[PDB]
Amino acid sequence: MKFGIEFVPNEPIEKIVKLVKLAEDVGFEYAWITDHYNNKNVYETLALIAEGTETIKLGPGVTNPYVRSPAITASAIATLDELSNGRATLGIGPGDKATFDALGIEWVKPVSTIRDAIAMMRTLLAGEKTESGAQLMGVKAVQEKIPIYMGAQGPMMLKTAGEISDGALINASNPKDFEAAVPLIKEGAEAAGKSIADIDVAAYTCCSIDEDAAAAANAAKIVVAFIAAGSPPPVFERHGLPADTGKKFGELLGKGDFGGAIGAVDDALMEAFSVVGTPDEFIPKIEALGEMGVTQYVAGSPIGPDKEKSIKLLGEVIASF
Amino acid sequence: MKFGIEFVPNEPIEKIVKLVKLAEDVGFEYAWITDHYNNKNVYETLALIAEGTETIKLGPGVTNPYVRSPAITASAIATLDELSNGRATLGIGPGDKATFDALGIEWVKPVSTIRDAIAMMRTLLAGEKTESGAQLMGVKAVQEKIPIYMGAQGPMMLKTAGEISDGALINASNPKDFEAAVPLIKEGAEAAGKSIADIDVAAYTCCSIDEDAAAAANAAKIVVAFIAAGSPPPVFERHGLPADTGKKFGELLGKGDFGGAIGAVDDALMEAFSVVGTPDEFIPKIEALGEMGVTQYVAGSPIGPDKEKSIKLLGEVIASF
Amino acid sequence: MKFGIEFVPNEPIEKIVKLVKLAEDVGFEYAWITDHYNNKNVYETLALIAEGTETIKLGPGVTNPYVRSPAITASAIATLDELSNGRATLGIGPGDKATFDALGIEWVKPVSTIRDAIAMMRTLLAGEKTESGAQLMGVKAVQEKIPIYMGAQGPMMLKTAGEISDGALINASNPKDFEAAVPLIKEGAEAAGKSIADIDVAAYTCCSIDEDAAAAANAAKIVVAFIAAGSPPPVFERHGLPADTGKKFGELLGKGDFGGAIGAVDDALMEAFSVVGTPDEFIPKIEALGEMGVTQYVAGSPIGPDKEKSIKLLGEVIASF
Amino acid sequence: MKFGIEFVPNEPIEKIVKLVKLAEDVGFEYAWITDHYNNKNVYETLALIAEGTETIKLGPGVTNPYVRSPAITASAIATLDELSNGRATLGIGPGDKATFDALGIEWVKPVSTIRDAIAMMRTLLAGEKTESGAQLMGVKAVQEKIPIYMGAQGPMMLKTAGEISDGALINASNPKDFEAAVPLIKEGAEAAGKSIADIDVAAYTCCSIDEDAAAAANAAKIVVAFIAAGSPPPVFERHGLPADTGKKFGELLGKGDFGGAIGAVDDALMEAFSVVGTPDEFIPKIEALGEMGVTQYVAGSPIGPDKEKSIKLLGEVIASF
Ligand SMILES: [Cl-]
Ligand SMILES: [Cl-]
């Protein structure tokens, strides 16, 4: 089991740099920085992180092919690869409708757009020239092949991730989810003459760890609420939950009733959409994920009540693997 | 007269950082970094430059509204403003069809596209929400109003710059060009109820300074050949140069005959398209630019035979103003 | 040689805007819209064209001092200049007795009227106050000097154009016409202390371009028929055509026998009153006009069998200049 | 009771378009744009407004028969009618001596001049040919009969408005004014075999609405000053005001002492020449106007301290009707 950790560039970058270095120091192998126009620039963040670290792999988790030309993305990743001396990773996903409407961007066929974006980035990152004539000149990747992970939350994306990516960042925290997802990724990989062993199945989980299991659960509630809000009914179906649970949280979060949403979050939901608790509790859960194909466990927001402490606690978990 | 300097991110960023720091040490107030998908990401470069400097203003010179959503650009710029404690600048221009063809981007209505991008960025950078509902959350500009400069090489762009920008980055090095351009910026400024005094007129010059005039001239020739090749007929007429000049250089460069191009660059062309020579020779030329309305002298490529050495020589020049 | 294009606002304004946009895209620098009380309002048309274009100059071609107070004309042009960001032009001619009889307007001293009109508009557009006390208040020109072109089809108008205008819109398509007309403009320019080089001599031609020279010629026949019907004796004399040619076509047209008029149009007439043929044929004819002092070639009605196609063909022609 | 709103084209047209769209969204059914040579062209303004709206009726309020030939006005209205798909209206008045003096136009027989102008325009707008031969050809009205409103501030104009118009735009804000005016309109309509029910009696009021009744009153004072300054003796007598009132303000404004004129405006004047206050206060006032025959309430300048806000407030008032 490999470990990754997520950070949202909504706090001072100098602070994020220190936290990533801490994560590196306790054993995390991957650092994933979210990419959203309303937060700090993901590449300016990653660049400063690269300077403050030495071995952890880092990249956007995930960017998308719409807010920036895939060529600009390839260039930003190659630039990061040079700064980090070969530690860049590239996570890319379809993005979200809310964002694109606010940016006046047409959200046309995400799968094929991602497919085309990756094809172009593969070419550019390889130092090659695309049929259209695009080619990197003043920047060059260090790695022979920078890994490209696809954020995949649906069947077509999962199959596609198997076919063209090196990893899948799946927004899920429970074994049952990967029991359903991995097979799709495998089907895609085989179709491409690849093996499921070639794809790093990353569990992009809602993570909250603390000595106080109660405090841990409380810091994750708001995150789990949005997760539920954004999940299709067949997902609540999979976890033995009410098919309309998501809609419920949708309305609360919609109004802006965060307090009510938090209060609506019970144990059945925490169990379905997050990995929360004490260090000891994380172990069997991560093992269960591993048994379902997860090869990378990503500690996602909120990480814990106190990030610095929680990363230290996660270090204990990593030492157990 | 204020001073700016250009750097192309096609060499190690650590080196660029050292060069901007040096430019800062000798009196430059602005650092302009080029932005092209085929070179290193301009924001990763700018972020590091900010970390390695303390008072110099810095920003892309220039980015464009097509390769990245202007909302991403605003975010990149606000992130830089935070990292730099309010020293960011934002230069933006139309871009070039060649690049966009390679990237599969349609180059629609450049003037209105830039005007719309700027309106959106003004709002986002001000911390406000756009009509479309876009708003910066995890990042906030330090400056109340981050300066936006427009690259303007035509009448419509110059008037627009006077109307909606805080400055115009004009690729011209001779007084006669500004004698013709400033009036248009002034028409725009006045149409917007502003004053020509509210616009920083920046001569984005081809600069080549060296103790050895001949060495300086030689280093700039290839740049002058490209400048001439991309110059519209009115520019030549204005300088008393054959109307065909641009097409001649265009063909010479197009067939890879760089020797011919360089050989065709004479005293007349150097005089019209660059500021080259010894420190003592720079003084009068820059004063002449100031008398035609230029408020910021930008030393652009190649800067000189040796950048580090030339930055120090420009330091002498700056001390003379 | 600069290129202009003429459109009659008797078809959807929406279509006209797109065609002007197309013209702008292929290189035309001027758009001229006719102004007749019986067609769509020229300014509503120009205002929408301004919204749908970016760089092409646009203006009425031509209006007159009788159907609207020159002050109203000044305001309409200044309004257009604001909307177009400094791209307005003002073509104004004496008008014609037919129209003014149908409108109950006394065609009093046309030369003095157009002269006094222009003086008033010059003052108003400059934002100054006339002796009579008129002054623009809620509208202001962007350009420091909006160009005023005079429709000049006779000696006194040509001399006056040279004396007080920035250009002359001459309804002629053959070099012999300008051979005779330019000297008159020159006389006026010199009488005013100006030079013929200060006046844009625009050939307001009957243009019809197409791959098929036969089809091109056929589309212009009806237009030529009318031009002939309205041409004075020295014109037919100049082109070695029967002195009664006008009266002839005048009767065929005055009886709705358009089929007859068209059939009565031969090569000698096509040669004397229009520029028709394939793109290859246009080049020499346009250069021939330029040799006679024409500085702006205006492609006038019908433009071609298919306006859209023809504008594209004229684009090829423009690329040759 | 129907609602109209007035805008003066002395601010960017794009802004006016949005304000009219807002007005349309909150229920206004008519938009009136003033027409003076010293402000932006009314038809270019109306054309862009038509583009940015869908149901509100729009037209000049009011134009006159002196600055443009009635035939030009007819085609301008017909053009607007096509652009808005049958939403054009036509307001016409006699104009003012001071304006025509400045334009060197002979202000003769206003009553018959308007009468003749309307007859001509009804013929042209109907697509028919005048006795003089004038006829629209390249433009055609959409509405079977475009409404023509006469600005009527006196007995003859009111009578005439009843006889030949479809509505009267009366510059008055108090019920007492319409008590005196409507009967004159009725007399004129009956004389023409028409019904007072056929004439839209529009109160072209000085309007100022705001949450703060004081702020509202303050924004309207300067407007009221001019109204009083231009009011005939019978009006002052009607509102128990000094016969000197008019000439007293006329003198102050003539001195350029607007601060004084404003300070001279008391509640008595506000009450006689405007509709100011909070939304709740407008309802009874508009009801009172309705009882006197007013069929359209026009919110004229200043509309309120902040137009956008005030339009929203008027939206509430409209909601009550
Ligand atoms: Cl970026
Ligand atoms: Cl008009």
Structural notes for this entry:
- The structure is a homotetramer of 321-residue chains.
- With 321 residues, the first copy, chain A, is α/β, with parallel strands linked by helices.
- Chain A has helices spanning 13-25, 42-51, 70-83, 97-103, 110-125, 155-164, 175-191, 213-229, 233-238, 245-255, 258-264, 267-273, 279-291, 307-319; strands at residues 2-7, 30-33, 57-60, 90-92, 148-151, 167-170, 200-209, 275-277, 296-303.
- In chain A, strands 1, 2, 3, 4, 5, 6, 7, 8 and 9 form a 9-stranded parallel β-sheet that branches.
- In chain A, strand 5, helix 6 and strand 6 form a beta-alpha-beta unit.
- The first copy, chain A, starts with a strand and ends with a helix.
- The structure holds chloride ion (2 copies).
What's the helix and strand layout?
Four copies of one chain form a homotetramer.
Chain A: E1 2-7, H1 13-25, E2 30-33, H2 42-51, E3 57-60, H3 70-83, E4 90-92, H4 97-103, H5 110-125, E5 148-151, H6 155-164, E6 167-170, H7 175-191, E7 200-209, H8 213-229, H9 233-238, H10 245-255, H11 258-264, H12 267-273, E8 275-277, H13 279-291, E9 296-303, H14 307-319
Parallel strand pairs in A: 1-2, 1-9, 2-3, 4-5, 5-6, 6-7, 7-8, 7-9
Helix pairs in contact in A: 1-2, 1-14, 2-3, 3-5, 6-7, 8-10, 8-11, 13-14
The structure holds chloride ion (CL) (2 copies).
Protein name (chains A, B, C, D): 5,10-methylenetetrahydromethanopterin reductase
Organism (chains A, B, C, D): Methanothermobacter marburgensis (strain ATCC BAA-927 / DSM 2133 / JCM 14651 / NBRC 100331 / OCM 82 / Marburg) (Methanobacterium thermoautotrophicum)
InterPro entries (chains A, B, C, D): F420-G6PD/mer, Luciferase-like_dom, Luciferase-like_sf, MeH4methanopterin_reductase
